[PDB]
Design an enzyme around this catalytic site. Structure first.
Site, short mmCIF file in Angstrom:
data_model
loop_
_atom_site.label_atom_id
_atom_site.label_comp_id
_atom_site.label_asym_id
_atom_site.label_seq_id
_atom_site.Cartn_x
_atom_site.Cartn_y
_atom_site.Cartn_z
N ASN A 151 0.83 -1.22 0.00
CA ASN A 151 0.00 0.00 0.00
C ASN A 151 0.87 1.28 0.00
O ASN A 151 0.33 2.35 0.24
CB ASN A 151 -0.98 0.01 1.18
N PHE B 243 16.78 3.18 -0.26
CA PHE B 243 15.39 3.02 -0.64
C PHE B 243 14.55 3.18 0.63
O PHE B 243 14.46 2.26 1.43
CB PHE B 243 15.21 1.67 -1.32
N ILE C 85 8.61 -6.12 -4.03
CA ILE C 85 9.40 -6.01 -5.23
C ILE C 85 8.52 -5.84 -6.47
O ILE C 85 8.82 -5.02 -7.37
CB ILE C 85 10.36 -7.20 -5.36
N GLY D 139 5.42 -4.63 -6.49
CA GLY D 139 4.82 -3.30 -6.44
C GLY D 139 5.72 -2.23 -7.05
O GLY D 139 5.25 -1.31 -7.72
N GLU E 285 4.22 31.40 15.76
CA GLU E 285 4.17 32.75 16.39
C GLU E 285 2.93 33.53 15.90
O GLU E 285 2.38 34.29 16.68
CB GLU E 285 5.45 33.53 16.11
N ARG F 208 15.84 42.99 11.50
CA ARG F 208 16.84 42.16 12.15
C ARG F 208 17.96 41.77 11.16
O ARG F 208 19.13 41.71 11.54
CB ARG F 208 16.16 40.96 12.82
N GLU G 224 17.98 30.86 19.07
CA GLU G 224 18.26 31.22 17.67
C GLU G 224 19.74 31.41 17.32
O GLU G 224 20.15 31.08 16.20
CB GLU G 224 17.49 32.48 17.30
C1 LIG Z 1 8.30 7.00 2.16
C2 LIG Z 1 8.51 6.27 0.86
C3 LIG Z 1 9.76 6.17 0.24
C4 LIG Z 1 9.90 5.52 -0.98
N1 LIG Z 1 11.11 5.40 -1.52
C5 LIG Z 1 11.29 4.81 -2.75
C6 LIG Z 1 12.64 4.75 -3.34
O1 LIG Z 1 13.63 5.31 -2.74
N2 LIG Z 1 12.76 4.16 -4.55
C7 LIG Z 1 11.72 3.64 -5.20
O2 LIG Z 1 11.92 3.13 -6.33
N3 LIG Z 1 10.44 3.65 -4.71
C8 LIG Z 1 10.20 4.23 -3.52
N4 LIG Z 1 8.90 4.26 -2.98
C9 LIG Z 1 7.76 3.74 -3.74
C10 LIG Z 1 7.09 2.45 -3.22
O3 LIG Z 1 7.50 2.22 -1.87
C11 LIG Z 1 7.56 1.28 -4.04
O4 LIG Z 1 7.29 1.58 -5.46
C12 LIG Z 1 6.94 -0.01 -3.51
O5 LIG Z 1 7.84 -1.02 -3.95
C13 LIG Z 1 5.51 -0.33 -3.96
O6 LIG Z 1 5.20 -1.67 -3.48
P1 LIG Z 1 3.88 -1.96 -2.66
O7 LIG Z 1 3.87 -3.45 -2.44
O8 LIG Z 1 3.78 -1.00 -1.48
O9 LIG Z 1 2.82 -1.64 -3.79
P2 LIG Z 1 1.26 -1.19 -3.67
O10 LIG Z 1 1.19 0.31 -3.36
O11 LIG Z 1 0.49 -2.18 -2.87
O12 LIG Z 1 0.93 -1.33 -5.25
C14 LIG Z 1 1.75 -0.68 -6.26
C15 LIG Z 1 1.27 -0.96 -7.64
O13 LIG Z 1 1.67 -2.30 -8.04
C16 LIG Z 1 0.47 -3.09 -8.29
N5 LIG Z 1 0.86 -4.47 -7.90
C17 LIG Z 1 1.40 -4.92 -6.75
N6 LIG Z 1 1.73 -6.26 -6.83
C18 LIG Z 1 1.38 -6.60 -8.10
C19 LIG Z 1 1.52 -7.83 -8.88
N7 LIG Z 1 2.04 -8.88 -8.23
N8 LIG Z 1 1.10 -7.88 -10.15
C20 LIG Z 1 0.62 -6.77 -10.73
N9 LIG Z 1 0.43 -5.61 -10.11
C21 LIG Z 1 0.86 -5.47 -8.80
C22 LIG Z 1 -0.65 -2.39 -7.61
O14 LIG Z 1 -1.86 -2.75 -8.31
C23 LIG Z 1 -0.25 -0.93 -7.76
O15 LIG Z 1 -0.60 -0.42 -9.04
C24 LIG Z 1 8.73 4.95 -1.71
C25 LIG Z 1 7.50 5.04 -1.10
C26 LIG Z 1 7.37 5.64 0.17
C27 LIG Z 1 5.99 5.71 0.74
O1 LIG Z 2 13.27 40.33 17.20
C1 LIG Z 2 12.55 39.28 17.04
N1 LIG Z 2 11.18 39.43 17.03
C2 LIG Z 2 10.31 38.43 16.84
O2 LIG Z 2 9.06 38.67 16.88
C3 LIG Z 2 10.83 37.07 16.64
N2 LIG Z 2 10.28 35.82 16.41
C4 LIG Z 2 11.37 34.98 16.34
O3 LIG Z 2 11.32 33.71 16.05
N3 LIG Z 2 12.59 35.61 16.50
C5 LIG Z 2 12.34 36.93 16.68
N4 LIG Z 2 13.13 38.04 16.90
#
Ligand SMILES: Cc1cc2nc3c(=O)[nH]c(=O)nc-3n(C[C@H](O)[C@H](O)[C@H](O)COP(=O)(O)OP(=O)(O)OC[C@H]3O[C@@H](n4cnc5c(N)ncnc54)[C@H](O)[C@@H]3O)c2cc1C
Ligand SMILES: O=c1[nH]c(=O)c2[nH]c(=O)[nH]c2[nH]1
Ligand code: FES
Ligand code: FES
Lengths: 1287, 98, 49
Positions: free
Chosen positions: A231, A307, A318, A320, A773, A851, A1232
């Protein structure tokens, strides 16, 4: 079936009507009332929602434990697992070692991130009871903290691996047998087979499939059925892209989608295998197999290092990643380059494809048919003479989106250096993963040598073209990266060929090139905190100057500390959601709410018409409560939907349709200059004779500098609960605000009732940093109107994307400077014109510009000087206070031209800075005398403890020895004036009561936002009263105990409130004096009870005003500041000249905090402030469309410092023997002043870039110095080819 | 307040003591965290005791506003208050009687 | 007081009083109390902190 059954903290949960749209986070908080687990972003990048899942793994016959982001976990996915939250591992009556250690080590300031970090550390220890330091750091790749600067967290936790601020020998030992049992029901339940489940919500049906046959039948009859595994992509589509999949099928239970099978050609993973499983399997193979077979495996592992974090990789599949088909997938380029084999199945079909350009035929498409699913992916063994590299360059190393990401593979004709196959694949260079198919074929049969390098580079530069308007910008940098990556691969392959012992000599790397091929690694931290012991004669009960932990640290670690949204809802409480402008500048032509009215639970849409009294609000009365007739930024609040639930409010807000007629918009600083669109007139400070100064100079240097803004990223967003009392207009508000007074004022004015009817209460904020603030009130006023209108309590907590859009940030600055100086480096003339981007209301913008002008000198005496400031009025969200408040911008500019003075004169920068520095008794440019001028001592101590001159030599040597990495080193001073620029704000109040049991209830005007202000006030009260801190309590801040309070800001709050508190305590002491004389030893309790039975008052107010402030811009006279803060930082960096990445190797800070009230808290403020400044100057960047729409609206795109961002060796000293008599108990303000000292990293980077450029003159480096700006400034054969088309 | 009109009387008292209309004064509730160590509302004495307390608290505010009154003898109450505030004068006071 | 809206998680308390002017408490049986829907607990002297 249709019941959902899981466990939470060992207790069985039976949910008979699970809605597929319900997240675990919402379920825990709203259904079970367990509010330890927090909402920080809703998009998986912050970790505040981290919990642990335990389940029985049928495929391994063992119990497994892993962390997840509760904000993205559908409860419908959790049948027959066991959840553990922060409440499940301990509480203040019995803290888990993890809880106790983060609290006692000063690892919790605002506390909002603390549960999430606890749960990441806890989860690690359940998998590995004796982790390495590296494993501990890695546990937090998905956890952000905005306050602490991360050092204390890692230092306290280092105790689990393998005078003092804390004592690790007093920590209770960890017994791993005492953790909660795996629920025996789930072991019994695992004997019975899984059946298919169906859950039906208000909009979505979820089928939890038990078998491959169930899944494929469903996809044959309903190809529309959306697969959900982790998800981590669909959750984002639903929550942020308003996508709705009415039928979901989760296949996570199906064995064939989770299997791992060895084959002759490689390892096959079921498409539902989580990335954490891929990592653990490939790690074992890499460790046991010969290097020659594991080239592709290591490429995948290198991408998986960067990742996301542990929480996402535990559930992200994988398959997904593959099917999401994001242009910036980090895995698809590696699968494509290695030709990984994919198996696709439908009911009755099965086919295989080797991934290639063809697999991705367009934007987020694959060649899967609608009824097919991905079954498995086979990651190949590498063959003899087959080499692989993977690369990723983002904004930040950990948990970021790739700018460019790549997989590269070469296969050599056996025994030769002649190419048989070459595959170069890239993410981030088009609307899909691509292969460089025009470039690579031309190299087949060529030898791996310089002509191939040059041929590939020319090929890539021509083939990977980007339009100058390409989506995502950064076109030079992206193109430069493709060549730079290929160069690293080229060199790495030469090294690998060198190990092979071929019959036919390959090129050897010069040792100066070696460091280009190194995989990123950081040494373990080495931290030093130095502070002053209190006098030997000081009573053990007098805690002033002792390192007492934050009073709420244990509760913050336990998740028992209550933040606004943790307060239970009333049975009759409603939810509010703001509706905002999608246009920078337009007439509102009409509003249609017909679709909103159909959403179940919809109550009303509030607009300007609904305001009882005044629609004019804001600090300078130039803001609307709700937009009337026209909108003036993207994010301008038009109205507010009221509904029963947040989900219903969000759906109804989508049904509010606004029609607009565009009006000419003014977006940038230059647009405002061209349109004469400013807040008020020019501000100017000028001293001496500029024409004379310039005409006497040896040298004149001109330039311009742009400084980007900054989002506060308090881990707790803006939040108000308004509770109408139904009598005489009375209303009580629970608010995350630094400014109770203006909240009260603004609510009262809007409603047209007196201030005396309106009570605002603040227990604590999960961070503020200036962003609460004033800008908190745009929420407060809206919820207050809803409460008034309905006569029901109403609540609103902003989602991160809403908060980042609506509430503004630090002011971007543009400056033009001209500096005149002697050959000696002595500055004799300076003229600076400053412009700030204010956005669409005045707010604090003019005071911020004041400031900046007050700090344009930084630490330097300049006899002939002129600064001007103009505040631009633009169609952007209004910018506001942010920790430093114009100081950092003004001082970066000073340090920027100072750096160019040193370069121009050809003298060492430290000497040029030192000879221009003020001395004791000097007047500033604004004619304030510098007394108690400790800066020279900070400087000398920092030069000595940093071993600056020695390390300068070591940097020089590294730079001679390394062509593609360079180091830089810089030492920066600062002076920061303490007091509000508006003199009357320098006041504060307290109220103290002593009850007849002798306990004391204290309150003051200050609000707690993680800075430890209440802790400091309790320390002050305990000294003043001469009783233990245990007998004094502060519960909250409220307008009905202390009125007319200044905001908790300007670093001044302990100074102002500490005096207030002290005076109230003196009043009580004076009243007890007769009872003390008649019984000079009898305990405190007897004096108090004797006072009470003598009818003597045991309640007192206290008050303080800072004396003798008041600057005039007209006469350049009068003191704006009560005193100055001083400090110095020395920082060393190492840049990657080929990627623009860098490491922060070491930082040494010496800070004057006077006689610290609390050295633990003051060291935490230095580190925290410093790390926010590191963000400001090197990492954090906001991006807006040409039409003024903020695009950067969450942690995915806005990269604050992470655990891995901080200096590896991080040394902080508080200056000894420097009492400041004119603040409370000789302390100084700390909040600050340290922030600007992170400019030492900026200028160290600049120095490293200079060394890079010499390897291949006043070049431009704007702020922030991001990977983009660093890489682009390291001009070379690659940048030249990409920009000019010339090798 | 238990129906005896105590808050009404205290408002009447404060309005005379401060020389401002009752309309500008409000009592919302009674709480241990605003006034501590209170006797019970009993012995018919509560207006006597709290009246004096209120009177004294009002006299303290008036003493603080005196210099602003002297400089602007006619200009309204609201102008004295804002002048005191922007001069950093406390506008909160306790009052007590035995 | 009772006009104040209930929190969503708010519970109700009922006091249980003596039907004798002067007597020893020989035992307390909460077995029927426990079967009433929504029952949470029966507090006695033992529960006083
Ligand atoms: C905070 C965060 C960081 C992330 N960082 C990266 C990153 O650095 N690099 C990167 O590449 N991605 C990144 N992602 C993207 C995501 O995490 C990946 O693409 C993840 O691998 C999706 O897999 P899931 O199982 O969560 O897929 P889901 O969200 O459950 O589904 C993804 C899609 O694949 C489909 N699906 C899943 N399994 C199948 C299957 N077996 N056959 C056909 N369709 C399928 C679903 O229908 C949907 O369309 C990030 C996401 C988050 C939230
Ligand atoms: O002279 C300041 N006035 C502010 O109202 C304020 N707010 C803040 O984060 N720093 C400062 N400094
Ligand atoms: S709230 Fe879940 S990761 Fe931020
Ligand atoms: S203590 Fe970590 S975000 Fe505040």
């Amino acid at each position: 079936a249709d019941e959902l059954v899981f466990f939470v903290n060992g207790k069985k949960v039976v949910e008979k009507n699970a809605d597929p749209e319900t997240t675990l986070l919402v379920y825990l908080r709203r259904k079970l009332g367990l509010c330890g687990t927090k909402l920080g972003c809703g998009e998986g990048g912050c970790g505040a929602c981290t919990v642990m899942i335990s389940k029985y793994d049928r495929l391994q016959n063992k119990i497994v434990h892993f962390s997840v982001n509760a904000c993205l976990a559908p409860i419908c996915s959790l049948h027959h697992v066991a959840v553990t939250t922060v409440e499940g591992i301990g509480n203040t009556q019995k803290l888990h070692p993890v809880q106790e250690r983060i609290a006692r080590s000063h690892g919790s300031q605002c506390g909002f991130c603390t549960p999430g970090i606890v749960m990441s550390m806890y989860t690690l220890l359940r998998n590995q009871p004796e982790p390495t330091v590296e494993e501990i750091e890695n546990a937090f790749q998905g956890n952000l903290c905005r306050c602490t600067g991360y050092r204390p967290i890692l230092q306290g936790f280092r105790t689990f691996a393998k005078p003092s601020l804390f004592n690790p020998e007093d920590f209770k030992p960890l017994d791993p047998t005492q953790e909660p049992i795996f629920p025996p029901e789930l072991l019994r339940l695992k004997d019975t087979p899984q059946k298919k489940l169906r859950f039906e919500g208000e909009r979505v049906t979820w089928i939890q499939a038990s078998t491959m046959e169930e899944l494929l039948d469903l996809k044959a009859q309903h190809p529309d059925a959306k697969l959900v595994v982790g998800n981590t992509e669909i959750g984002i589509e639903m929550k942020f892209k308003n996508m709705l999949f009415p039928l979901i099928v989760c296949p996570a239970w199906i064995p064939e989608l989770n299997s791992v099978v060895h084959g002759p050609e490689g390892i096959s993973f079921g498409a539902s295998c989580p990335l954490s499983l891929v990592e653990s399997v490939l790690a074992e193979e890499i460790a046991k197999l010969p290097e020659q077979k594991t080239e592709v495996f290591r490429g995948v592992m290198e991408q998986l290092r960067w990742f996301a974090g542990k929480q996402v990789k535990s559930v992200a599949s994988i398959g997904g990643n593959i099917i999401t088909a994001s242009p910036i997938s980090d895995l698809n380029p590696v699968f494509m380059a290695s030709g990984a084999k994919l198996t696709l199945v439908s009911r009755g079909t099965r086919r295989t494809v080797r991934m290639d350009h063809t697999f991705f035929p367009g934007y987020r498409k694959t060649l899967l048919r609608p009824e097919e699913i991905l079954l498995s992916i086979e990651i190949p063994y590498s063959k003899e003479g087959e080499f692989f590299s993977a690369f990723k360059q983002a904004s930040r190393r950990e948990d970021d989106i790739a700018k460019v990401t790549s997989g590269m593979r070469v296969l050599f004709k056996p025994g030769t250096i002649e190419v048989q196959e070459l595959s170069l694949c890239f993410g981030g260079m088009a609307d899909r993963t691509i292969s460089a198919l025009k470039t690579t074929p031309k190299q087949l049969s060529k030898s791996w040598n310089e002509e191939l390098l040059q041929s590939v580079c020319a090929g890539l530069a021509e083939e990977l073209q980007l339009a100058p308007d390409a989506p995502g910008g950064m076109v030079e940098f992206r193109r430069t990266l493709t060549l730079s990556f290929f160069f690293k691969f080229y060199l790495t392959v030469l090294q690998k060929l060198g190990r092979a012992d071929l019959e036919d000599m390959c090129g050897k790397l010069d040792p100066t090139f070696a460091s280009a091929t190194l995989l990123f690694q950081k040494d373990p931290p080495a931290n030093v905190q130095l502070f002053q012991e209190v006098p030997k004669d000081q009573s053990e009960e007098d805690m002033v100057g002792r390192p007492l932990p934050h009073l709420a640290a244990n509760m913050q670690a336990s998740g028992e500390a209550v933040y606004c949204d943790d307060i239970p809802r009333y049975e009759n409480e409603l939810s509010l959601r703001l509706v905002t402008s999608t246009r920078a500048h337009a007439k509102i032509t009409s509003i249609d709410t017909s679709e909103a009215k159909k959403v179940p639970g919809f109550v009303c849409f509030l607009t300007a018409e609904d305001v009882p009294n005044s629609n004019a609000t804001g600090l300078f009365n130039d803001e609307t409560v709700f937009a009337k007739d026209e909108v003036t930024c993207v994010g301008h609040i038009i109205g507010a939907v009221v509904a029963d639930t947040p989900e219903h409010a969000q759906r109804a807000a989508r049904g509010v349709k606004i029609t607009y007629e565009d009006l000419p918009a003014i977006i940038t600083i230059q647009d405002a200059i061209n349109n004469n669109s400013f807040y008020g007139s020019e501000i100017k400070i000028e001293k001496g004779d500029l024409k004379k100064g310039f005409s006497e100079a040896d040298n004149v240097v001109s330039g311009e500098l742009y400084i980007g803004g900054q989002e506060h990223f308090y881990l707790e967003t803006n939040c108000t609960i308004a509770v109408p009392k139904g009598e005489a207009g009375e209303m009580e508000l629970f608010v995350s605000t630094q400014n109770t007074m203006k909240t009260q004022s603004f609510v009262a004015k809007m409603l047209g009732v007196p201030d005396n009817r309106i009570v605002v209460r603040v227990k604590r904020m999960g961070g503020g940093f200036g962003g609460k603030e004033t800008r908190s009130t745009v929420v407060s006023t809206a919820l207050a109107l809803a409460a008034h209108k309905t006569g029901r309590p109403v609540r609103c907590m902003l989602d991160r994307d809403e908060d980042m859009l609506i509430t503004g940030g630090r002011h971007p600055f543009l400056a033009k400077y001209k500096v005149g100086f002697m050959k000696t480096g002595t500055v004799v003339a300076l003229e600076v014109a400053h412009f700030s981007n204010g956005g669409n209301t005045e707010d604090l913008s003019r005071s911020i510009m004041e400031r900046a002008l007050f700090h344009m000198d930084n630490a330097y005496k300049i006899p002939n000087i002129r600064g001007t400031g103009r505040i631009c009025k633009t169609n952007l969200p209004s910018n506001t206070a942010f920790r430093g408040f114009g100081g950092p911008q003004g001082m970066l500019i000073a340090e920027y031209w100072m750096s160019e003075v040193a370069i121009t004169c050809g003298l060492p920068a430290e000497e040029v800075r030192r000879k221009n520095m003020y001395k004791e008794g000097d007047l500033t440019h604004f004619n304030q005398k510098l007394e108690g001028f400790t800066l020279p001592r900070c400087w000398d101590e920092c030069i000595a403890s940093s071993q600056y001159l020695a390390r300068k030599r070591e940097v020089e040597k590294f730079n001679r020895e390394n062509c593609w990495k360079k180091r830089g080193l810089c030492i920066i001073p600062t002076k920061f004036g303490i007091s509000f620029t508006l003199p009357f704000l320098n006041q504060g109040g307290a109220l103290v009561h002593v009850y007849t049991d002798g306990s004391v209830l204290l309150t003051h005007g200050g609000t707690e936002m993680g800075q430890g202000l209440h802790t400091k006030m309790v320390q002050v009260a305990s000294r003043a009263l001469k009783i233990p801190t245990s007998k004094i309590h502060i519960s909250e801040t409220s307008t009905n105990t202390v009125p007319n309070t200044s905001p908790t800001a300007a670093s001044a709050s302990a100074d102002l409130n500490g005096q207030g508190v002290y005076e109230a305590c003196q009043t009580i002491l004076k009243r007890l004096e007769p009872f003390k004389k008649k019984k000079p030893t009898g305990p405190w309790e007897a004096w108090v009870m004797d006072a009470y039975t003598s009818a003597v008052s045991l309640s007192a107010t206290g008050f303080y005003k800072t004396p003798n402030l008041g600057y005039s811009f007209e006469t350049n006279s009068g003191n704006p500041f009560h005193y100055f803060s001083y400090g110095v930082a020395c920082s060393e960096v190492e840049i990657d000249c080929l990627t623009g990445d860098h490491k922060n190797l070491r930082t040494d800070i010496v800070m004057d905090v006077g006689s610290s009230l609390n050295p633990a808290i003051d060291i935490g403020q230095v580190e925290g402030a410093f790390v926010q400044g590191l963000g400001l100057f090197t990492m954090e960047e906001l991006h807006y469309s040409p039409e003024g729409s903020l695009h950067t609206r969450g942690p995915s795109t806005y990269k604050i410092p992470a655990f891995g961002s901080i200096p590896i060796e991080f040394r902080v000293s508080l200056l000894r023997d420097c009492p400041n008599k004119r603040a409370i108990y000789a302390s100084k303000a700390v909040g600050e002043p340290p922030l600007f000292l992170a400019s030492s990293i900026f200028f160290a980077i600049k120095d490293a870039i200079r060394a890079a450029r010499a390897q291949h003159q006043l070049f431009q480096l704007d702020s922030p110095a991001t990977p983009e700006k660093i890489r682009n400034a390291c001009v070379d054969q690659f940048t030249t080819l990409c920009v000019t088309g010339v090798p």
